[PDB]
């Protein structure tokens, strides 16, 4: 029954390089991790300076 569902949701394109899209998604995840880490890092440093004078 699973084979029929996968056939029903089959993309009419080359199935070999479907993981190249995943590699590009991993590059986007790299960018997202860059954003996350830098943002939180200097936000935490600002929180540190906030508690210092506080």
């Amino acid at each position: 029954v699973d084979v029929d569902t996968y056939l029903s949701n089959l993309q009419t394109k080359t199935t070999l390089s479907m993981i190249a899209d995943g590699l590009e998604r991993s590059a986007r995840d790299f960018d997202a991790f860059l954003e996350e880490n830098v943002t939180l890092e200097w936000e935490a440093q600002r929180k540190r300076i906030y508690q210092h004078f506080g």
Partner: protein
């Protein structure tokens, strides 16, 4: 212990097709062809080594003899697969109708069932196929098509599936199996007896084993036993009796429905065929024992059967069987002659032979007398031999009256001689016997029109040779017998039939006997020597044939040369002008001897017979003086070519004598050259021949010049006006040019440059002008074929020329233009081949073969230093064929269509092997030519090709060609693979083939070369399928998939047992079916998964780390490629599993067999550049003209991994062979070096392919290993990838051709996987090891962000960034990490920042700048640098980063857009200011003033600044203002806040618009904006107490803030109204936004 298990496989295997029965047809084919791969294949080898097969081939009747074996049949047919019912029914019906054993009928029906597809494919084309071939032909013009009464393919199939047609096919297969069994035994006989030497080792072993086992004939004994071999003759003679009986009576129990005209003709032809082959077997058996007699009882029985059947004439009366009559008549007459062996008969009776049995004598006499009185000519030789025998017997007894006496007295021949003299006279009268002997010799000769093979032909010629031998003396020298013997020896051959092939020593006896035995040598050889030149034919043909037949015989290689250089006798007609130059001797009146009295100067240094020479007037004169006849003939040719008459000289050469002389000269030159180039032969033999032919001629003119002037003089006029003799002279001259081409190319090319035959710019060309509708009969076809072959040899010599001197008097331009004009002429001939009326289809076949081969060579070298030598001709051909106009396209394609039609319409025959070989040769040549043309059209880039459609339409013929003959399988599928490959870059295939046709082709293709299990055929068919999938033939693939799947799976069940060459292709196709058609195969994959995964595990865990150390050192390439294919196979299925979410276990199991790839997969460690460098050194120092890279393949064909890959060994073999030492001694030299080097690079290519396949594989595996458990496996994986990158990115040392992609994909994989783990938060704290090396790698590149290396620099900096991120996620302290991180970050940030500023002074650059800033902060956040702040400040002070940043943030402004560079610059400054030391340095550098004087501040001052503002300028301004100032303000106030509070307050009071607007709309990053503003105001309010001058007024209305934030404090739903983040919201952004709000609310209370 002699079973039929091997002779016929079990029933279920027969029906399923798993195993194909080794029918007698395929055995006969493999034997007649003597194909090594076929005969030595396991299946056929075992079949031939079977004792049961031995027994039946010894007793032929057992194959079809009717015995009662119900037991066997019932046991074989019972208990097995539905369908056995019809097979059993047909088998029993056949056994009862033909009256044979049931096993034979069963196997016949099984053969028919297995060949159902072939039978359906061979039937005439259907309506759709007819229309397709018509469209392919075209309207413009004689195709001679089949009738249009053919029904639709559907009706044809429905009639095919009936019972009547199935029974007809079964009967046809039975008859064909009779014929094929007899032919197979004949071929086996001649393969055992007279196989040529130098035979392959395994084939010689098979031959010896057959001999020993089946015949007790062990060559390991001095004199092996031949009894079992001699027992054949009588058995097959009885079989011939049975066959002549069958031919006169049809099967009784068969119904008249099957007894139709076609079936009757088939039965008679089958009987005649088996009779012929049995007679061949018997004649071989009797030829083995040349010098001894045969038993008299066998002779009696044979001659009685002859008398009854008039020597097989009773069945050869019809006309449709003449093709089988001439051969059978020749063979039976010859075997009778053989039995007699007159030589020894008449030797014996003057010095048990059948002469001691008057019964046998009476039998022979009555048979001969009946055959003579009847009056058929096929019996004349036997009758003449018997007449001579009886004559000698009569003399013998007459000398006794002063057992055969009983015979003579019984036939009343004791005292009268006229009874035998009458037969003798009638046999010799009008040369009847001699003419039929010549005919028998032609059909028994070495030519391509002979009926039997060459060997049987030679022995059959020997018998007639002996007859003429013993009849010579009693009948004077005459034209009839001498011409008969000349035809016996020559067999109507030509110059092109010359060759240095080594045949069985026994097979040259017909030729050596001329100089071995006395009678012949004295009566005919010496006689022709004596009559020359008066009789030119006798001596000319003798020398012409012997020079070619003695090429390999070293003892007699000098006799022709000695006769020509040293001839003892001479004979010429007497010119009255010499009446004053002689005087009689007066010794005997009849002798008529005389002596010369003067110097007779023939042609009156010159040719003169000195004074006082002896001579004789026999009727013409003969002088016995030693001289050189070669120079004489050369001078005669010179004279007749110069048209110079000589009254006082001898008679000139006539047209016929002229042609024969030129032909002989050409042949002798060719033979001399051939045996000179042979090992040991005097290499200067052809040159000496040319010299002696040029002797006593004009000083500087040579025989070659004579031929040149003759050609010129006769081509003065046009070709059509020239008569037959002159055309033959021109053909002989062309043959002489071809012969001379080898030893003196220079001269030949220099002549061809200005030859009128060839088209030129001056005159169009005489050869080009004879095109039209004239008939190409012998006279003209000889010339045409000779010219075409000369052109082919010219192309060959041009392509094989890498460089006193062979190439003299020629130059590049000469070669080029001659080649262009030769291509033009060849194209003209190929065009005119359509309308010409050839003598027969065989001439057309030969001509098309030769011309297509020439054009194919041109295309091949078209494919680059010396390509220009002949590039214009190749360009001409390819342009004429790939983009011609419509009429041109149709007329250029017509010959190919005709070739296909002739190919599959001509019936298969077991005789005339030469014709079949030539036809198959032209078929394969046209197929490969079309393939090469399609390859060229695809490469060069011409898309609109008419040949494409012409072939797609002719697919009806291509798909059926394999059914007519199996040899076409390979080239047909190569061509069709190319046809779909050039089109994939869509066309329909069934629309042309058809449902039934396509299905039958599918089934025939299924089970690739199952009988023989060969490698090349397998590979071709599998690559064909793979390319079929890869060119998007979506319909045919889907149809053929439904048990080829199971076939491939079963092939892959035992990969270790099967060859690697086989495996790489099969699995390439599996990959091509998986990637492009995943859903159909994944179900089947599930079905065979256990077995398949097992095998893949084994192959992948073989892990041979040092391929070269292990025995399979040169087989490392196929190993690496199959490994890469296995990886690519498992990878995509595991990715689909990831998508299926059931991968958690399959990945954990798969990860255990990745060691091979872990060790050397990502790394491309093994290149060994040193070897390629030394190869280049050698080739360069030994050859200044040519360089190493000149042999690089142009990817013209689909580059094939194998013996030759990067370097084209195929062409080097011929080009670099001209020089000695290239091959070397004991396989040592440069050839070996090229082989090893191209193999190393082959596996290097496969290695890069594996890099890509593993790039694919590892990723979905790591993604399937995301769950927390099994951390050790993924730890191993990340560890191994960082290790491989570490050791691969450095000391790579690759070629810089295909390494571009590697340099980037390596870094890509690294960063991707490292970030994946970073997401899992399971990386170890100690990453300093790789960090140091990655810094080294970034320092290795020579130009930072260079145009060529910019992508690489970007990716490497991203890798360093993520590695720093991972590093600071550690606790090094509760070689040191701190110093390493410090140094590397210092160098990189400083250098990159300042260089980027420099170039961007005046997009990729600001993106990289953002990345640099990110790296700066990521490294500043490391726990170990807070304690070394001073050093960061120190080295940030050394390099003026501060000044350049402050400079370029104000890069460009207008004064009373959007600031991007400013944004990034002050972001960099803020991250430098993160800790208070650099913040203090910035505060002390008056940074505030610098950015306040800049106009980015002026833009910030305007009122349109907003968080989500209308223009990107204002939005950028909001973001930059906030980020750059507010956090930086607090960071600088951290240090000495009391001192710099004035400056912060002043910069805040300078711009109040934002201060007001922000708080107004607070009444989303505005949260942090007001947070920072509130903190700053609250701290500076407290600091304001000390000094009023500082912070004069706060100018901040923070009262609104404590109410604003409180209104959004308690509303969960209200809080998500105006929240829109630039970064992804993803458990909610609320969680942290409200946290900031809480943090801000309290302080200001």
């Amino acid at each position: 212990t002699l079973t039929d298990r091997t002779y016929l496989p079990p029933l279920e295997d027969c029906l399923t097709g798993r195993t194909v029965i080794l029918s007698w047809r395929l055995v006969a084919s493999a034997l007649e062809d003597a194909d090594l791969a076929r005969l030595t294949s396991p299946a056929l080898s075992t079949f031939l080594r079977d004792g049961f097969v031995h027994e039946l081939l010894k007793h032929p009747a057992r194959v079809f003899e009717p015995k009662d074996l119900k037991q066997e049949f019932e046991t074989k047919t019972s208990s097995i697969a539905p369908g056995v019912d019809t097979i059993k029914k047909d088998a029993l019906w056949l056994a009862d109708a033909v009256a044979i054993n049931q096993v034979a009928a069963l196997r016949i029906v099984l053969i028919e069932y297995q060949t159902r597809a072939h039978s359906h494919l061979v039937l005439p084309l259907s309506t759709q196929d007819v229309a397709n071939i018509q469209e392919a032909a075209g309207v413009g013009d004689l195709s001679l098509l089949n009738p249009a009464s053919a029904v639709d393919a559907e009706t044809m199939w429905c009639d095919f599936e009936t019972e009547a047609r199935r029974r007809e096919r079964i009967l046809a297969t039975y008859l064909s199996e009779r014929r094929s069994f007899t032919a197979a035994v004949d071929a086996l006989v001649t393969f055992l007896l007279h196989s040529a030497p130098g035979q392959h080792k395994d084939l010689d072993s098979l031959r010896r084993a057959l001999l020993k086992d089946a015949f007790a004939f062990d060559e390991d004994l001095d004199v092996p036993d031949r009894s079992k071999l001699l027992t054949m003759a009588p058995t097959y003679m009885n079989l011939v009796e049975d066959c002549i009986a069958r031919a006169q009576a049809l099967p009784a129990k068969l119904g008249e429905s099957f007894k139709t005209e076609a079936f009757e003709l088939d039965w008679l032809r089958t009987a005649i065929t088996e009779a012929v082959h049995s007679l061949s077997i018997a004649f071989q058996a009797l030829d083995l024992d040349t010098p001894y007699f045969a038993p008299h009882e066998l002779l009696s029985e044979w001659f009685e059967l002859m008398n009854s059947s008039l020597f097989l004439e009773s069945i050869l009366g019809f006309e449709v069987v003449a093709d089988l009559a001439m051969p059978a008549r020749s063979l039976v007459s010859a075997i009778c002659l053989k039995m007699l062996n007159i030589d020894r008969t008449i030797q014996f009776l003057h010095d048990e032979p059948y002469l001691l049995s008057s019964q046998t004598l009476n039998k022979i006499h009555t048979a001969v007398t009946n055959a003579v009185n009847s009056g058929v000519a096929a019996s004349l030789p036997v009758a003449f031999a018997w007449s001579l025998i009886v004559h000698q017997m009569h003399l013998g007894y007459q000398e006794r009256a002063e057992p055969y006496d009983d015979f003579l007295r019984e036939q009343r021949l004791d005292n009268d001689i006229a009874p035998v003299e009458q037969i003798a006279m009638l046999a010799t009268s009008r040369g009847q016997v001699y003419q039929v002997m010549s005919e028998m010799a032609l059909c028994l000769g070495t030519t391509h029109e002979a009926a039997f093979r060459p060997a049987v032909g030679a022995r059959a010629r020997l018998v007639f040779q002996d007859l003429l031998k013993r009849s010579a003396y009693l009948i004077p020298y005459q034209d009839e017998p001498v011409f008969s013997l000349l035809a016996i020896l020559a067999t109507g051959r030509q110059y092109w039939d010359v060759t240095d092939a080594l045949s069985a020593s026994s097979l040259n006896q017909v030729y050596t006997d001329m100089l071995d035995d006395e009678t012949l040598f004295t009566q005919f050889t010496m006689q022709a020597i004596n009559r020359f030149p008066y009789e030119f034919n006798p001596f000319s043909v003798l020398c012409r044939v012997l020079a070619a037949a003695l090429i390999t015989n070293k003892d007699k290689a000098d006799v022709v040369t000695g006769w020509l250089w040293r001839t003892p006798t001479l004979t010429v007609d007497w010119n009255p002008a010499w009446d004053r130059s002689y005087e009689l001797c007066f010794e005997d009146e009849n002798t008529n001897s005389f002596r010369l009295t003067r110097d007779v100067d023939l042609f009156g240094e010159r040719f003169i017979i000195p004074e006082g020479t002896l001579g004789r007037f026999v009727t013409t004169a003969r002088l016995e003086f030693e001289h050189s006849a070669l120079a004489l003939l050369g001078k005669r040719l010179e004279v007749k070519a110069a048209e110079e008459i000589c009254d006082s000289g001898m008679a000139p050469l006539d047209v016929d004598e002229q042609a024969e002389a030129v032909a002989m000269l050409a042949t002798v030159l060719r033979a001399e050259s051939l045996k000179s180039t042979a090992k040991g032969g005097d290499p200067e033999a052809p040159l000496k021949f040319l010299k002696e032919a040029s002797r006593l001629l004009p000083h500087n003119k040579d025989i070659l010049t004579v031929i040149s002037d003759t050609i010129d003089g006769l081509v003065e006029k046009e070709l059509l006006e020239l008569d037959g003799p002159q055309i033959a002279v021109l053909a002989s001259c062309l043959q002489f040019l071809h012969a001379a081409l080898a030893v003196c190319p220079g001269r030949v090319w220099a002549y061809m440059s200005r030859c009128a035959l060839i088209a030129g710019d001056a005159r169009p060309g005489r050869l080009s002008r004879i095109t039209g509708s004239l008939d190409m009969y012998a006279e003209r076809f000889d010339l045409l074929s000779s010219a075409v072959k000369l052109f082919a040899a010219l192309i060959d010599s041009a392509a094989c020329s890498a460089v006193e001197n062979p190439w003299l008097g020629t130059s590049e331009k000469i070669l080029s233009r001659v080649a262009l004009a030769i291509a033009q002429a060849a194209l003209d001939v190929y065009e005119s081949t359509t309308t010409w009326r050839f003598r027969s289809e065989l001439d057309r076949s030969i001509l098309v073969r030769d011309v297509v081969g020439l054009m194919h060579k041109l295309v091949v070298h078209a494919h680059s230093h010396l390509t220009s030598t002949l590039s214009p001709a190749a360009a001409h051909i390819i342009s004429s064929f790939l983009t011609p106009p419509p009429s041109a396209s149709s007329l250029r394609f017509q010959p190919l269509l005709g070739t296909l039609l002739v190919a599959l319409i001509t019936p298969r025959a077991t005789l005339y092997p030469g014709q079949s070989r030539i036809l198959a040769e032209r078929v394969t040549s046209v197929l490969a030519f079309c393939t090469s043309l399609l390859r060229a059209a695809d490469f060069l880039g011409q898309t609109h090709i008419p040949l494409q459609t012409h072939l797609f339409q002719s697919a009806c013929l291509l798909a059926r060609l394999p059914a007519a003959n199996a040899v076409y399988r390979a080239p047909v599928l190569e061509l069709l693979r190319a046809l779909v490959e050039v089109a994939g870059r869509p066309p329909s295939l069934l629309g042309y083939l058809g449902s039934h046709a396509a299905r039958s082709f599918i089934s025939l293709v299924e089970g690739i070369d199952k009988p023989f299990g060969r490698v090349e055929h397998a590979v071709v068919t599998w690559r064909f399928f793979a390319a079929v999938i890869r060119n998007r033939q979506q319909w045919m693939a889907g149809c053929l998939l439904t048990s080829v799947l199971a076939a491939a799976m079963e092939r892959l069940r035992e990969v270790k047992s099967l060859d690697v060459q086989e495996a790489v292709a099969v699995m390439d196709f599996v990959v091509s079916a998986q990637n492009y058609w995943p859903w159909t195969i994944f179900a089947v994959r599930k079905e065979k998964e256990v077995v398949d995964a097992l095998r893949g595990y084994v192959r992948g865990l073989k892990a041979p780390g040092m391929v070269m150390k292990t025995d399979g050192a040169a087989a490392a390439a196929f190993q690496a490629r199959i490994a890469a294919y296995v990886a690519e196979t498992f990878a995509m299925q595991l990715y689909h599993m990831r998508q299926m979410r059931q991968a958690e276990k399959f990945a954990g199991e798969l990860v255990a067999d990745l060691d091979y790839f872990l060790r050397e997969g990502v790394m491309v460690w093994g290149y060994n550049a040193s070897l390629h460098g030394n190869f280049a050194r050698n080739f360069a120092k030994r050859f200044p003209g040519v360089e190493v890279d000149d042999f690089k393949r142009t990817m013209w064909l689909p580059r094939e991994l194998g013996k030759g890959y990067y370097y084209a060994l195929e062409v080097a073999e011929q080009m670099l062979g001209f020089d000695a030492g290239w091959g070397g001694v004991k396989q040592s030299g440069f050839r070996k070096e090229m082989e090893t080097a191209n193999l190393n690079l082959s596996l290097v290519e496969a290695q890069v392919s594996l890099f890509h396949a593993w790039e694919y594989l590892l990723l979905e595996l790591t993604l399937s290993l995301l769950p927390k458990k099994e951390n050790a496996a993924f730890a191993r994986q990340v560890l191994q990838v960082v290790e491989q990158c570490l050791e691969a990115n450095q000391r790579s040392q690759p070629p810089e051709n295909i390494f571009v992609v590697l340099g980037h994909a390596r870094a890509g994989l690294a960063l991707t996987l490292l970030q994946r783990l970073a997401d899992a938060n399971q990386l170890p704290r100690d990453v300093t090891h790789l960090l140091a090396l990655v810094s080294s790698a970034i320092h290795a590149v020579e130009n930072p962000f260079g145009a060529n290396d910019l992508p690489y620099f970007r990716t490497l900096l991203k890798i360093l960034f993520v590695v720093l991120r991972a590093a600071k996620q550690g606790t090094a302290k509760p070689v040191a990490i701190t110093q390493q991180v410090l140094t590397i970050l210092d160098r990189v940030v400083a250098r990159c920042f300042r260089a980027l500023a420099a170039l961007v002074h005046e997009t990729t650059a600001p993106e990289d700048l953002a990345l640099i800033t990110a790296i700066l902060q990521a490294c500043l956040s490391v726990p170990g640098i807070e304690q070394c702040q001073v050093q960061v400040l120190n080295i940030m002070a050394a390099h003026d980063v501060f000044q350049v940043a402050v400079a370029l943030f104000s890069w460009a402004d207008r004064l009373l857009g959007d600031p991007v560079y400013g944004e990034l610059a002050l972001l960099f400054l803020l991250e430098l200011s993160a800790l208070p030391a650099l913040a203090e340095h910035l505060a002390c550098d008056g940074l505030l003033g610098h950015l306040a004087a800049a106009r980015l501040a002026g833009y910030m001052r305007r009122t349109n600044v907003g968080p989500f503002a209308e223009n990107a300028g204002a939005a950028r301004c909001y973001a930059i203002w906030a980020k750059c100032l507010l956090p930086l303000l607090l960071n600088i106030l951290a240090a000495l806040g009391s001192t710099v509070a004035p400056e912060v307050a002043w910069v805040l009071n300078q711009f109040p618009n934002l201060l007001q607007s922000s708080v107004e709309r607070i009444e989303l990053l505005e949260i942090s904006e007001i947070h920072s503003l509130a903190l700053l105001t609250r701290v500076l309010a407290a600091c304001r107490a000390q000094n009023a001058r500082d912070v004069p007024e706060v100018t901040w209305d923070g009262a609104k803030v404590l109410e604003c934030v409180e209104y959004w404090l308690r509303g969960r739903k209200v809080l998500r109204e105006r929240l829109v983040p630039l970064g992804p919201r993803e458990n909610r952004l609320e969680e942290k936004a409200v946290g900031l709000l809480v943090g801000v609310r309290e302080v200001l209370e």
